[PDB]
Design an enzyme around this catalytic site. Structure first.
Site, PDB file in Angstrom:
ATOM      1  N   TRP A 115      37.494 -48.459   1.756  1.00  0.00           N
ATOM      2  CA  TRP A 115      36.372 -49.384   2.067  1.00  0.00           C
ATOM      3  C   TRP A 115      36.019 -50.342   0.888  1.00  0.00           C
ATOM      4  CZ3 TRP A 115      35.531 -48.239   6.701  1.00  0.00           C
ATOM      5  CH2 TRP A 115      35.742 -46.997   7.405  1.00  0.00           C
ATOM      6  N   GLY A 163      28.534 -51.778   5.688  1.00  0.00           N
ATOM      7  CA  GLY A 163      28.684 -51.479   4.039  1.00  0.00           C
ATOM      8  C   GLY A 163      27.127 -51.775   3.684  1.00  0.00           C
ATOM      9  N   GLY A 164      26.184 -51.150   4.336  1.00  0.00           N
ATOM     10  CA  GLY A 164      24.871 -51.235   3.959  1.00  0.00           C
ATOM     11  C   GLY A 164      24.174 -52.563   3.600  1.00  0.00           C
ATOM     12  N   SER A 202      27.877 -49.578  11.569  1.00  0.00           N
ATOM     13  CA  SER A 202      26.794 -49.151  10.414  1.00  0.00           C
ATOM     14  C   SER A 202      25.996 -50.536  10.296  1.00  0.00           C
ATOM     15  CB  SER A 202      27.607 -48.519   9.268  1.00  0.00           C
ATOM     16  OG  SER A 202      26.589 -47.888   8.484  1.00  0.00           O
ATOM     17  N   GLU A 222      27.333 -37.800  10.700  1.00  0.00           N
ATOM     18  CA  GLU A 222      27.093 -39.025   9.917  1.00  0.00           C
ATOM     19  C   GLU A 222      26.723 -39.118   8.606  1.00  0.00           C
ATOM     20  OE1 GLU A 222      27.478 -42.082  11.113  1.00  0.00           O
ATOM     21  OE2 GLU A 222      27.493 -41.851  13.418  1.00  0.00           O
ATOM     22  N   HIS A 250      30.981 -40.502   9.011  1.00  0.00           N
ATOM     23  CA  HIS A 250      30.496 -41.844   9.131  1.00  0.00           C
ATOM     24  C   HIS A 250      31.554 -42.753   8.704  1.00  0.00           C
ATOM     25  CE1 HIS A 250      27.695 -45.309   9.032  1.00  0.00           C
ATOM     26  NE2 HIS A 250      28.202 -45.719   8.183  1.00  0.00           N
TER      27      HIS A 250
HETATM   28  C1  LIG Z   1      27.956 -49.791  -5.414  1.00  0.00           C
HETATM   29  C2  LIG Z   1      28.265 -50.321  -4.403  1.00  0.00           C
HETATM   30  C3  LIG Z   1      28.722 -49.524  -3.278  1.00  0.00           C
HETATM   31  C4  LIG Z   1      28.036 -48.366  -2.609  1.00  0.00           C
HETATM   32  N1  LIG Z   1      28.143 -47.971  -1.225  1.00  0.00           N
HETATM   33  C5  LIG Z   1      29.380 -49.131  -0.523  1.00  0.00           C
HETATM   34  C6  LIG Z   1      26.692 -48.142  -0.462  1.00  0.00           C
HETATM   35  C7  LIG Z   1      26.804 -48.783   0.861  1.00  0.00           C
HETATM   36  C8  LIG Z   1      25.470 -48.482   1.559  1.00  0.00           C
HETATM   37  C9  LIG Z   1      24.356 -48.711   0.994  1.00  0.00           C
HETATM   38  N2  LIG Z   1      23.357 -48.390   1.994  1.00  0.00           N
HETATM   39  C10 LIG Z   1      23.974 -47.912   3.159  1.00  0.00           C
HETATM   40  C11 LIG Z   1      23.311 -47.570   4.312  1.00  0.00           C
HETATM   41  C12 LIG Z   1      23.976 -47.183   5.354  1.00  0.00           C
HETATM   42  C13 LIG Z   1      25.236 -47.031   5.136  1.00  0.00           C
HETATM   43  C14 LIG Z   1      26.167 -47.466   4.032  1.00  0.00           C
HETATM   44  C15 LIG Z   1      25.247 -47.980   3.008  1.00  0.00           C
HETATM   45  C16 LIG Z   1      26.303 -46.388  -0.426  1.00  0.00           C
HETATM   46  N3  LIG Z   1      27.384 -45.242  -0.201  1.00  0.00           N
HETATM   47  C17 LIG Z   1      27.785 -44.881  -1.637  1.00  0.00           C
HETATM   48  C18 LIG Z   1      28.665 -45.564   0.802  1.00  0.00           C
HETATM   49  C19 LIG Z   1      29.945 -44.862   0.696  1.00  0.00           C
HETATM   50  C20 LIG Z   1      30.503 -44.040   1.627  1.00  0.00           C
HETATM   51  C21 LIG Z   1      30.042 -44.554   3.069  1.00  0.00           C
HETATM   52  C22 LIG Z   1      30.420 -43.779   4.343  1.00  0.00           C
HETATM   53  C23 LIG Z   1      31.788 -44.003   4.910  1.00  0.00           C
HETATM   54  C24 LIG Z   1      32.767 -43.555   3.975  1.00  0.00           C
HETATM   55  C25 LIG Z   1      32.245 -42.563   2.887  1.00  0.00           C
HETATM   56  C26 LIG Z   1      31.879 -43.800   1.805  1.00  0.00           C
END
Ligand SMILES: CCCC[N@H+](C)[C@@H](Cc1c[nH]c2ccccc12)C[N@H+](C)CCC1CCCCCC1
Ligand SMILES: *[C@@H]1O[C@H](CO[C@@H]2O[C@@H](C)[C@@H](O)[C@@H](O)[C@@H]2O)[C@@H](O[C@@H]2O[C@H](CO)[C@@H](O)[C@H](O)[C@H]2NC(C)=O)[C@H](O)[C@H]1NC(C)=O
Ligand SMILES: *[C@@H]1O[C@H](CO[C@@H]2O[C@@H](C)[C@@H](O)[C@@H](O)[C@@H]2O)[C@@H](O[C@@H]2O[C@H](CO)[C@@H](O)[C@H](O)[C@H]2NC(C)=O)[C@H](O)[C@H]1NC(C)=O
Ligand SMILES: *[C@@H]1O[C@H](CO[C@@H]2O[C@@H](C)[C@@H](O)[C@@H](O)[C@@H]2O)[C@@H](O)[C@H](O)[C@H]1NC(C)=O
Ligand SMILES: *[C@@H]1O[C@H](CO)[C@@H](O)[C@H](O)[C@H]1NC(C)=O
Ligand SMILES: *[C@@H]1O[C@H](CO)[C@@H](O)[C@H](O)[C@H]1NC(C)=O
Ligand SMILES: *[C@@H]1O[C@H](CO)[C@@H](O)[C@H](O)[C@H]1NC(C)=O
Length: 526
Positions: free
Chosen positions: A79, A113-114, A195, A322, A435
């Site tokens: 990712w 990716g949030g 997402s 999820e 997820h």
């Molecule tokens: C330090 C910078 C990178 C941090 N990440 C990419 C964040 C991204 C994110 C922030 N807020 C969110 C709300 C909703 C969905 C996603 C997010 C949080 N997680 C650490 C995701 C990591 C996991 C996500 C699920 C898919 C596979 C397993 C991996």
């Protein structure tokens, strides 16, 4: 191999796919690079060029923090950006079938990716299989994430908020003005995303500036009403100034804070994004969509409730697990390298990590509703309950609630429940159908037999690819030829949904009914 666009000519490249050919245009710019004085501002029109732009490779990803929690682990690193990070990142990609189509339906992908990470160059977003197999045109775009894309000083054009959404919108309009030259039908455009991408698609359904830029919408594991999807104007202000002091640009002329933030280097802004929230969670969205008064004219839960959105068909769905992926990012007792059997006390500790600003009573209410077991023996309980908690609260029931309220205004809606764990899944088995791991099946990666997927996975993806394409072309996600289960319309009374798996494709009703009633009615009161 050369296409004339409204701002210049672009050279693509030829790709061999499944004994056929797909023409790829990787890295077409769609905006003036948001550098210097344009950082934090809405994307600007791109000046026409006179040469042939060589769109033969993915362009830069937008600046973003990287997941460093499992170095060397493909489960997390798949990712992370697979191309250079840069503020010069407002580019898009186009996959067209060969030979050139005449009026092809267009699929536009918005990555998740949030709202802080993500890039369209990812291997699992490769649009060549969809173009080859279903003769649609696939478009994907990079958009600014994090503070660079969503820093909000409401009303102030120097940092108005929702810039990343406006990047998306400018890319959609680029498709409107240019995709006919590629053989695309600008009147048959379906947005799909996962997402935060899905939540972005849902916000395009509400933004009037986007209502003429697309036809239909697909929402994979996300919607704007998810608790992480929209930042308050309260939090937004508190957070842009917390960033200001953390970078030593606190001023009183709010415009002068931005010009000071515009001289700090991207990495300094990146490294302070995490600390601007008092207590973060593994789902923290430090800089996300806000009610800017421009892209979003009101609070979106009101717009959803009062029927203020583009009236069209939606395809919505979630995965069975999820929430599991996020538990190994902070919850105690959890690890991808063991089966993470946790205690009642660890479960309680896990709730404080995922609900840090929640009262003692609120956290007990979650424990009460999720820990009255069918059965007390089994050691997997607190482990699976915590996954269901994060899953149901953050994704599944926001998606179901969005689909209920959207369908109540007369539009056809289709809900799926993805419950196949991929044979190639690098994460442990206790995380289940995670997820983001329906994406490879949507893009048809199991269709390449040389990539270690079982034949049942090839057939499931091939059906999903057909259903997605039929939805985009015809507003109806059926597979009509191979005696497949018909996908019933999701209505707010009976709430029928379709399960997606290798074995049994079945019609069920009222997904997670007991869980969502807690999450959508009781819990918002605490
Ligand atoms: C330090 C910078 C990178 C941090 N990440 C990419 C964040 C991204 C994110 C922030 N807020 C969110 C709300 C909703 C969905 C996603 C997010 C949080 N997680 C650490 C995701 C990591 C996991 C996500 C699920 C898919 C596979 C397993 C991996
Ligand atoms: C709004 O922001 C203030 C300030 O955030 C602090 O300063 C930032 C630069 C960054 O370093 C944050 O991590 C800091 O928290 C918050 O006020 C702080 O609240 C926490 C405890 O709740 C604690 O760090 C301090 O007691 C507070 N600091 C100050 C200067 O008041 C506040 O919680 C944020 N949220 C709201 C709703 O006001
Ligand atoms: C599953 O593993 C976690 C920790 O993972 C491994 O163990 C550590 C010792 C360290 O080597 C890590 O880098 C590894 O990835 C276990 O959680 C730990 O449990 C004990 C309890 O005393 C202790 O080491 C720490 O407090 C815990 N660490 C945490 C919570 O981060 C967990 O117990 C393991 N579960 C099972 C069922 O084996
Ligand atoms: C744009 O590309 C032109 C043609 O490049 C052709 O394709 C690439 C993938 C290479 O295989 C190259 O050897 C081929 O000729 C170039 O002639 C031209 O200089 C390029 N222009 C710019 C500005 O990069
Ligand atoms: C493509 O289809 C639209 C309607 O969906 C039509 O208006 C347009 O003329 C078509 N363009 C062609 C066939 O080139
Ligand atoms: C500082 O003053 C006002 C806001 O108080 C603003 O209009 C002005 O543009 C700011 N100064 C500069 C140099 O922009
Ligand atoms: C239908 O079945 C045939 C084999 O009988 C297969 O080749 C084809 O890909 C299937 N179509 C879909 C849409 O799954």
């Amino acid at each position: 191999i050369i296409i004339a666009t409204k701002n210049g000519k672009v050279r693509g490249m030829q790709l061999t796919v499944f004994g056929g050919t797909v023409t790829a245009f990787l890295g077409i710019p769609y905006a003036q690079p948001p550098l210097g004085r344009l950082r934090f501002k809405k994307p600007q029109s791109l000046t026409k060029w006179s040469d042939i732009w060589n769109a033969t490779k993915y362009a830069n990803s937008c600046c973003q923090n990287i997941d460093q929690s499992f170095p060397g682990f493909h489960g997390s690193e798949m990712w992370n950006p697979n191309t250079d990070l840069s503020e010069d990142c407002l580019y898009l990609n186009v996959w067209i079938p060969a030979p050139k189509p005449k009026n092809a339906t267009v699929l536009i992908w918005i990555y998740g990716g949030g709202f802080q990470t993500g890039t369209s160059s990812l291997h699992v977003y490769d649009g060549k299989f969809l173009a080859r197999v279903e003769r649609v045109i696939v478009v994907s775009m990079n958009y600014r994430v994090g503070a660079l894309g969503f820093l909000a000083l409401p009303g102030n054009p120097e940092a108005p908020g929702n810039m990343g959404l406006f990047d998306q919108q400018l890319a959609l309009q680029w498709v409107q003005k240019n995709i006919a030259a590629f053989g695309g039908n600008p009147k048959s455009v379906t947005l799909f995303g996962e997402s935060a991408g899905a939540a972005s698609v849902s916000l395009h359904l509400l933004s009037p500036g986007s209502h003429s830029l697309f036809t239909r919408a697909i929402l994979q594991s996300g919607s704007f009403n998810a608790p992480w999807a929209v930042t308050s104007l309260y939090e937004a202000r508190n957070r842009t100034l917390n960033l200001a002091k953390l970078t030593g640009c606190s001023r009183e002329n709010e415009t002068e804070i931005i010009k000071c933030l515009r001289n700090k280097d991207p990495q300094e802004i990146l490294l302070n994004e995490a600390f601007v929230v008092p207590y973060g969670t593994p789902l923290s969205v430090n800089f996300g969509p806000t009610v800017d008064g421009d892209f979003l004219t009101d609070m979106p839960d009101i717009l959803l409730e009062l029927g203020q959105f583009k009236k069209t068909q939606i395809l919505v769905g979630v995965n069975k697990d999820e929430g599991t992926a996020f538990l190994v990012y902070g919850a105690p007792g959890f690890s991808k390298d063991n089966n993470s059997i946790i205690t009642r006390k660890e479960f309680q500790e896990g709730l404080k990590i995922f609900f840090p600003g929640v009262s003692e009573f609120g956290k007990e209410s979650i424990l009460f509703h999720y820990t009255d077991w069918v059965d007390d023996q089994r050691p997997e309980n607190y482990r699976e309950a915590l996954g269901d908690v994060v899953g149901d609260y953050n994704f599944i029931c926001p998606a179901l609630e969005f689909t209920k309220k959207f369908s109540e205004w007369g539009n056809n809606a289709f809900f799926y429940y993805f419950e196949h764990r991929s044979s190639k899944l690098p994460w442990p088995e206790w995380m289940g159908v995670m997820h983001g791991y329906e994406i490879e099946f949507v893009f048809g990666l199991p269709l390449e037999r040389r990539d270690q997927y079982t034949k049942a996975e090839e057939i499931l993806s091939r059906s999903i690819v057909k259903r997605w394409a039929n939805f985009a072309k015809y507003g109806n996600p059926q597979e009509t030829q191979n005696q497949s289960t018909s996908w019933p319309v999701f209505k707010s009374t009976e709430q029928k949904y379709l399960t997606l798996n290798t074995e049994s494709t079945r019609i069920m009703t009222k997904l997670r009914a007991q869980q969502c009633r807690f999450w959508t009615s009781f819990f918002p009161k605490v």
